[PDB]
Amino acid sequence: MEIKRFGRIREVIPLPPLTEIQVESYRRALQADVPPEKRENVGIQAAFRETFPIEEEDKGKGGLVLDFLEYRLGEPPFPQDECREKDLTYQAPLYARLQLIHKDTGLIKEDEVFLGHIPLMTEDGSFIINGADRVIVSQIHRSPGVYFTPDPARPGRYIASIIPLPKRGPWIDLEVEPNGVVSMKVNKRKFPLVLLLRVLGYDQETLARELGAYGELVQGLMDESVFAMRPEEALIRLFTLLRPGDPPKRDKAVAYVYGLIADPRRYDLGEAGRYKAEEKLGIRLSGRTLARFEDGEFKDEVFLPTLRYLFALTAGVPGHEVDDIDHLGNRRIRTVGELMTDQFRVGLARLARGVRERMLMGSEDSLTPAKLVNSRPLEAAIREFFSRSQLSQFKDETNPLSSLRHKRRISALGPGGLTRERAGFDVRDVHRTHYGRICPVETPEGANIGLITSLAAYARVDELGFIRTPYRRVVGGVVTDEVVYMTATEEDRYTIAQANTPLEGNRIAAERVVARRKGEPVIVSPEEVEFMDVSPKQVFSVNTNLIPFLEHDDANRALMGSNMQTQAVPLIRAQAPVVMTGLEERVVRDSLAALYAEEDGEVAKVDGNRIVVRYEDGRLVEYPLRRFYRSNQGTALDQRPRVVVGQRVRKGDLLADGPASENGFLALGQNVLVAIMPFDGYNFEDAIVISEELLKRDFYTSIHIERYEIEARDTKLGPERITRDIPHLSEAALRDLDEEGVVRIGAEVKPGDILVGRTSFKGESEPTPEERLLRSIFGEKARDVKDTSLRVPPGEGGIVVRTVRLRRGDPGVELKPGVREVVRVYVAQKRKLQVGDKLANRHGNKGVVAKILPVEDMPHLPDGTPVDVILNPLGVPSRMNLGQILETHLGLAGYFLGQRYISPIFDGAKEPEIKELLAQAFEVYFGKRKGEGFGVDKREVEVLRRAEKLGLVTPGKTPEEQLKELFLQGKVVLYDGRTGEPIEGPIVVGQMFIMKLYHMVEDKMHARSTGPYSLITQQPLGGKAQFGGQRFGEMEVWALEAYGAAHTLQEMLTLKSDDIEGRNAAYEAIIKGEDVPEPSVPESFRVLVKELQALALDVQTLDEKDNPVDIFEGLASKR
């Protein structure tokens, strides 16, 4: 096979490390690989320094100084796989150096205290919390700064906002309502903007003239002069303004709080907050946030500039001071590291809280180790974030691509501080700045609609979570190969152009060429083009980039296509698309599906379980291959060796293929020849007709594994024994229960077979009088033990492949309390494609198999080769994704030309280039036909007749020539298969890639006859083996109500769900073939009446004449 790739836009730079976000964030987060000497001090070390110097001075005796030296964590308790076999949280041990000082001679240094076991990251970027690999999804929010937004209801003038995160930490607003008041609010109630400047030292005269000479608003400032005439007294006066009934005297205490340390922030001095400053408003910052504690007299280079800019914003063009909040230079992305560092610091505070109490509890000086440190907080805290945070979830590894995406996805629903469930509608939409920074497709149509999405191609989190998107520079009419990752904000200052601009190299080629200033499409000139787009790829996400001709598909349906791939299941037979975009390679590679060769060398052994290669460096290493592992969602992950024995390997070449790779290429589902016409009704709205032949070959077939588990619980009635003993009826069911108790590996288990046996006790506390007689009659001596045995749940099982049992003397495992022992049973099964299944191409055409046709009679081409699947055309006009029809065509060429292609995103193949390849295909198709010995059918000629009358072929040309034309159009003649006659009119056909979608647990069609019932609510409930009833909602009630369905609705409310006495007599009646009984009162009704009686109210039903009647049959009358 050969590869031909069409578009030419010089791809200047390789895509970045896809999991860089997850990997590097945790790198900077926990800087543990490098000594405390190394400078990166953010994250852990930062959070540590933040709360370590615990100064506790006076109330009794103090002068406490506990100081941090160096943070070191290094020897993991156990390893990865052992952490999955056994329930274990892969976490590194950490204990930093600590030394507490004394006001008396002595400083005790108790070196280590290991508090907090913090999880580690896998080399791919995923975690391992408890058994399941988990992932921490990034988030978005208002980057702590100051903005000015238009006022709420009064059309008049807008107000100022100062945003300080963490939560604890004031939230300021400056608003002027001139009849006599100005408003500045910290927690809530407002006060004067000048009483404060006065406090700091700004007097009426110097203030008003320098700041607002150009600003008449200065008059509101010098207004209440009575108080402006006393400096430091203004300090006490504002204190007075706050409200508790506090001591007037507190020298410089609260001013400190809004001064240097806590409330304002320790975000790195320099670029954290001072960036939002010098560019947006005001020039300097002395001390991180408005901070100072040297003379008692505070300095505030921030309090005056904010007003300075409000006087400026309100008075003209110092610049145009309006902040579009959604500008990404305002909305920041929280990489993993930050998310963990914050929970780590929260724990540090919980820790430092308890320690303070113990600076008073310890008797004399030996209080360094246990007296100050308790590991209970940090454990619960960080543990809670990895197992319970709404943000970290099961790794979605249906197929690698999936998990990769789930690792990079961004969420709102988080801290609660940033964006909750209320809407913020504007945020949900795809903002202008989302360019190269977020996929415009990447959003879950439905409930949580704009609140989530995975990021883009070249998108990278620079220093602080600001997705900078790359844009290359173009000085004059010259375009460069240099790139600038720009902030959202700066992007608007320049005139940027799209990549589609005809380029000669550094030369722009057309005078009137498109560019877009700031969210506005603008036809600019080559001389104005300041910057240019990097690529068509950076615009979207990975998951999306994988789509062929994205260019021709409605952005709405292209979403479906992207989410579809996230639902792709690994087939034992994985093939790459006949037509690819170009990243399939990089996907499998950057994801960790296939195994690549470190350095050059030769191959030694090629097992089905290992490839021990020999590098030319004089070394050889064994490369195990995850034979058959269980993915979180139950898909097979096997590495099939692609290298033979003794082979010189290039550095970075596929030794084995990942779960779904063919040859280092991503491959899901399989390329199948497909006709695109209507069949009877088999493909009616969105139904798919499939050729039986597809099953003959093991084409769409997938291996699944479910993990049934049972426990031996300790009841006070007697331990539940796990034995081959199944008390009541046969040995026939005990065969596969070979091992005494457990089931034998390799045994075929059907629904209702014993997977594992167990024996618990009969009653709650007492034996049975009636059951006493029966046992005695045929065999008194009857093991009173109950059959509580894990059985195959309806639905399906396969053949047991592995089993695990953990008994009494536990190795290094965690058995829950009461839990005597556990028994796992891994079962595997081959899933061959069937009518229930759903398959869908990358474009979005989704559909279910409705009929598997015998190759005998499905559409067949002139040469005996028949089509595998017949897709309905109707599904194409409405939806707008011609891309699939473009794929099919290139596919046809690749079938006869025996070649695969790579059509980039928007630069790819072009309609003429394809008509070209089709022209070559015509000779392979029909050229052989010529030589093989035959010409054209009566049929082939006949469909030509109807085709020229149609208008597909130039009348007057020879059939040979006419068919070429007809072929180039992408359609060929097809005969029925059932009749052998032709299908009037050419029909297109070709090689379209189609994947098979994963079957959810719901897919296991749930059918329930009778079963359990809830304890307080008496409505049907399922769980383990009984399916659980379907819900009959109001919307459905009305449906019946509309109909004359009286009884049928009664039934739905009585006999079927709540009529306690009803459902019982119901069953029994049915059992005897009795026309079911007439409904008794529903328990929902009785539950109610009583609920109602619980409250004073008395609800009594009445008769024809206002008289009693009785709902509660006979249990309410007394005694």
XYZ file of C-alpha atoms in Angstrom, residues 13-264:
252
model
C 5.989 23.158 13.931
C 5.095 19.733 15.334
C 2.063 19.428 17.564
C 3.038 19.773 21.266
C 3.175 16.979 23.848
C -0.547 16.248 24.025
C -0.531 15.375 27.843
C 1.909 18.258 28.626
C -0.878 19.975 30.614
C -1.292 17.085 33.015
C 2.396 16.032 33.155
C 4.097 19.425 33.598
C 1.537 20.846 36.034
C 2.196 18.038 38.476
C 5.889 18.545 37.774
C 5.955 22.184 38.869
C 3.341 21.292 41.523
C 5.584 18.815 43.285
C 9.146 19.806 42.391
C 10.396 16.630 44.157
C 12.673 15.257 41.336
C 14.984 18.216 41.928
C 16.753 19.265 45.235
C 15.344 22.110 47.361
C 18.292 24.007 45.909
C 16.526 24.274 42.489
C 14.558 27.563 42.112
C 10.996 26.486 41.041
C 9.301 27.021 44.407
C 5.626 27.101 43.388
C 3.118 24.449 44.502
C 3.953 22.162 47.466
C 7.162 23.978 48.470
C 5.279 27.260 48.061
C 2.183 26.149 49.960
C 4.565 24.832 52.541
C 6.483 28.117 53.005
C 3.093 29.837 52.982
C 1.916 28.237 56.251
C 5.085 26.968 57.870
C 6.460 29.953 59.793
C 3.904 29.634 62.552
C 4.298 32.726 64.699
C 2.420 32.356 67.949
C 3.447 35.038 70.402
C 1.444 36.059 73.436
C -1.397 34.807 75.540
C 0.437 33.150 78.390
C 3.898 32.165 77.028
C 5.016 31.901 73.405
C 7.503 33.186 70.854
C 6.991 30.075 68.774
C 8.869 29.693 65.545
C 8.496 26.389 63.645
C 10.543 26.672 60.411
C 10.742 24.797 57.104
C 14.017 23.575 55.676
C 13.623 21.075 52.829
C 10.771 19.027 51.422
C 11.668 15.454 50.502
C 9.498 12.546 49.369
C 10.985 9.507 47.669
C 10.237 5.818 48.284
C 6.762 4.690 47.055
C 5.165 2.163 49.496
C 4.188 -0.263 46.732
C 4.189 -0.278 42.889
C 1.572 0.470 40.181
C 0.268 -3.008 39.221
C 0.422 -4.236 42.828
C -1.736 -1.171 43.544
C -4.343 -2.419 41.036
C -4.244 -6.123 41.934
C -4.601 -5.212 45.591
C -6.858 -2.245 46.334
C -4.198 0.375 46.755
C -3.588 4.030 46.265
C -0.297 4.589 44.561
C 1.157 7.472 46.629
C 4.674 8.701 47.445
C 5.770 9.230 51.111
C 6.576 12.752 52.210
C 8.284 14.149 55.261
C 10.013 17.523 55.222
C 12.583 18.774 57.695
C 11.194 20.751 60.689
C 12.857 22.656 63.615
C 10.831 24.538 66.345
C 12.516 27.487 68.177
C 12.249 28.560 71.833
C 12.274 31.836 73.733
C 14.464 29.921 76.220
C 17.869 28.411 75.187
C 17.161 25.486 72.895
C 15.929 24.636 69.414
C 14.753 21.045 68.979
C 14.911 19.731 65.418
C 12.831 16.607 64.912
C 13.841 15.801 61.340
C 11.024 13.773 59.861
C 7.341 13.295 60.309
C 5.571 11.515 57.490
C 2.229 13.070 57.225
C 0.311 12.829 54.017
C 0.670 10.190 51.391
C 0.259 11.983 48.145
C -0.644 10.169 44.895
C 1.746 10.113 41.958
C 1.233 10.452 38.240
C 1.701 7.714 35.690
C 4.118 8.443 32.862
C 1.071 8.868 30.548
C -0.577 11.432 32.783
C -3.233 9.405 34.623
C -3.479 8.381 38.253
C -4.240 5.354 40.306
C -6.286 6.223 43.330
C -8.300 3.128 44.350
C -8.102 0.246 41.906
C -9.196 2.467 39.013
C -6.977 4.817 37.094
C -8.344 8.328 37.716
C -7.953 11.712 36.069
C -7.961 15.337 37.369
C -9.813 17.611 34.894
C -8.732 21.230 34.529
C -11.057 24.193 35.310
C -11.814 27.861 34.345
C -12.584 31.167 36.156
C -12.137 34.899 36.665
C -8.379 35.491 37.024
C -8.097 37.614 40.303
C -7.886 41.231 39.011
C -10.016 44.445 38.742
C -12.570 45.334 36.104
C -15.300 47.877 35.423
C -18.681 46.654 34.301
C -21.840 48.663 33.367
C -24.285 49.347 36.234
C -27.258 46.866 36.791
C -30.617 48.657 36.166
C -29.971 52.470 35.884
C -28.756 53.046 32.193
C -26.535 55.863 33.615
C -22.906 55.007 34.567
C -20.815 51.824 35.279
C -19.064 50.672 38.491
C -15.577 49.282 39.501
C -14.813 45.785 40.848
C -11.723 44.518 42.688
C -11.561 40.673 42.644
C -9.431 38.941 45.345
C -9.445 35.132 45.460
C -9.283 32.965 47.924
C -12.863 33.391 49.127
C -11.905 34.819 52.494
C -10.581 38.091 51.209
C -12.661 41.281 50.492
C -14.531 41.998 47.248
C -14.546 45.726 46.472
C -16.869 47.857 44.314
C -16.770 51.649 43.580
C -20.096 53.309 42.585
C -21.145 56.993 42.547
C -24.817 58.035 43.098
C -24.179 61.982 43.189
C -27.316 63.338 45.010
C -25.045 63.000 48.080
C -23.417 59.518 48.249
C -20.542 57.396 46.830
C -20.276 53.645 47.421
C -17.293 51.419 48.172
C -18.250 47.999 49.535
C -16.046 45.311 51.054
C -18.373 42.816 52.750
C -21.579 44.754 52.005
C -22.368 48.235 53.492
C -20.744 51.240 51.691
C -18.409 54.115 52.969
C -16.150 57.242 51.465
C -13.376 56.702 48.893
C -11.324 59.491 50.454
C -11.450 58.626 54.187
C -9.181 55.805 53.125
C -6.730 57.796 51.006
C -6.558 60.214 53.944
C -5.619 57.305 56.236
C -2.807 56.307 53.912
C -1.673 59.893 53.581
C -3.355 61.364 50.505
C -4.627 64.848 51.486
C -7.517 66.673 49.764
C -5.219 69.142 47.925
C -2.446 66.893 46.488
C -5.082 64.243 45.614
C -7.764 66.298 43.827
C -5.322 68.387 41.731
C -2.862 65.724 40.466
C -5.387 62.911 40.078
C -8.526 64.666 38.944
C -7.599 68.079 37.659
C -8.478 66.518 34.346
C -11.252 64.874 36.361
C -14.022 67.105 37.707
C -15.176 64.122 39.822
C -12.478 65.273 42.191
C -15.216 67.404 43.785
C -16.878 64.366 45.311
C -13.546 63.530 46.922
C -12.832 66.820 48.797
C -16.539 67.010 49.820
C -16.657 65.901 53.516
C -13.742 68.124 54.581
C -14.602 67.934 58.364
C -13.079 64.430 58.538
C -10.447 65.004 55.836
C -8.749 67.495 58.193
C -7.533 64.789 60.688
C -4.978 62.094 59.279
C -4.357 59.104 61.624
C -7.658 59.826 63.348
C -9.292 58.814 60.032
C -7.756 55.404 60.636
C -9.630 55.047 63.942
C -12.724 56.579 62.382
C -13.038 53.937 59.672
C -12.442 51.270 62.324
C -15.472 52.820 63.955
C -17.279 52.566 60.616
C -16.860 48.782 60.608
C -19.289 47.332 63.109
C -19.005 45.212 66.352
C -18.450 47.831 69.006
C -14.687 47.438 68.902
C -11.835 49.060 70.893
C -10.981 52.390 69.221
C -7.353 51.585 69.934
C -5.678 48.979 67.784
C -2.539 50.693 66.537
C -1.986 49.083 63.109
C -3.776 45.654 63.384
C -6.666 45.545 60.884
C -4.866 47.839 58.420
C -2.297 45.004 58.220
C -4.885 42.517 57.039
C -5.710 44.627 53.956
C -2.082 45.392 53.936
C 0.639 42.738 53.486
C 0.068 39.045 54.499
C -3.121 36.897 54.199
C -6.219 38.400 52.441
C -4.293 40.001 49.589
